[PDB]
């Protein structure tokens, strides 16, 4: 199937409570592989998956240099943005940046991303063509012009279509045993009586990887969403994920209902009945 590499960077100002705290995390698909926390002991980019420990010292030195520089740009940005929006020096604010690339089943480039948020809303984003910018508001036009004049988009395009894709491939190879695994969901259904009048059917999916999954209810083989509840896919803590979907049914009618499970670890979609 398809794969992605993504980096996520967050800084929060807290005036009167020191300088901003910065956190960076890197993922391949749903697996975290590096972290940096500006207040942690090491002051280095740190490994979070076994296969990244294959990288030598030049890598750790370079990734540390880059992530520390990024922490400092986020610090400068918090100041700049307070100015742009005419804000007090008293409030706490948040900057976020995400970037990375997607590849398909052939491991070739599908798309790249590079985008920024201020205080929980869009600020500026690279468009899909990797040549132009979407400014979210009037203030962001100033940054758009700055980045257009400095030819940032061209530099980002080269990374996203080149380095990003190559390093994602390298990681997939180096961590094949785990990253290229597909753990099919362990599935079952439970039944609980709401009263004499209705019961809840709950369809479980456990121990699966990657996180992408679809759970759907049908009644008489017809798609049903009314009287259903679907929880957000959640991490188990061991590298795998969990999800459930439930439907409330009239007593005596449980057999009309089926749960349908789609996951890449499955040769064919599964159907469950009570």
């Amino acid at each position: 199937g398809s794969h992605s590499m993504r980096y996520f960077f967050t800084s929060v100002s807290r005036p009167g409570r020191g300088e901003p705290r910065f956190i960076a995390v890197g993922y391949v698909d749903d697996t975290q592989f590096v972290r940096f926390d500006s207040d942690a002991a090491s002051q280095r980019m740190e490994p979070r998956a076994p296969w990244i420990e294959q990288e030598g010292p030049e890598y750790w030195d370079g990734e540390t240099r880059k992530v520390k520089a990024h922490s400092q740009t986020h610090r400068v940005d918090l100041g700049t943005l307070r100015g742009y929006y005419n804000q007090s020096e008293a409030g706490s604010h948040t900057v976020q940046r995400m970037y990375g690339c997607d590849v398909g089943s052939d491991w070739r480039f599908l798309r790249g991303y590079h985008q920024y948020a201020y205080d929980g809303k869009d600020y500026i984003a690279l468009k899909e063509d990797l040549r132009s910018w979407t400014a979210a508001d009037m203030a962001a036009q100033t940054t758009k012009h700055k980045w257009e004049a400095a030819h940032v988009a061209e530099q980002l395009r080269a990374y996203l279509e080149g380095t990003c894709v190559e390093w994602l491939r390298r990681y997939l190879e180096n961590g094949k045993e785990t990253l290229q695994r597909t753990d099919a969901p362990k599935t079952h259904m439970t039944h609980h009586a709401v009263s004499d009048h209705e019961a809840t059917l709950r369809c479980w999916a456990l121990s699966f990887y990657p996180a992408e999954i679809t759970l759907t209810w049908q009644r008489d083989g017809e798609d049903q969403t009314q009287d259903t509840e679907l929880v957000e896919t959640r991490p188990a803590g061991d590298g795998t994920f969990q999800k459930w979907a439930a439907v409330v049914v009239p007593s005596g009618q449980e057999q009309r209902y089926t749960c349908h499970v789609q996951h890449e670890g499955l040769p064919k979609p599964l159907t469950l009945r009570w």
Binding site: Y59, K66, A69, I124, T143, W147, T163
Partner: peptide, 9 residues
């Protein structure tokens, strides 16, 4: 691997 550029808003 991170991008090798520094940018400020």
């Amino acid at each position: 691997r991170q991008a090798s550029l520094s940018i400020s808003v």
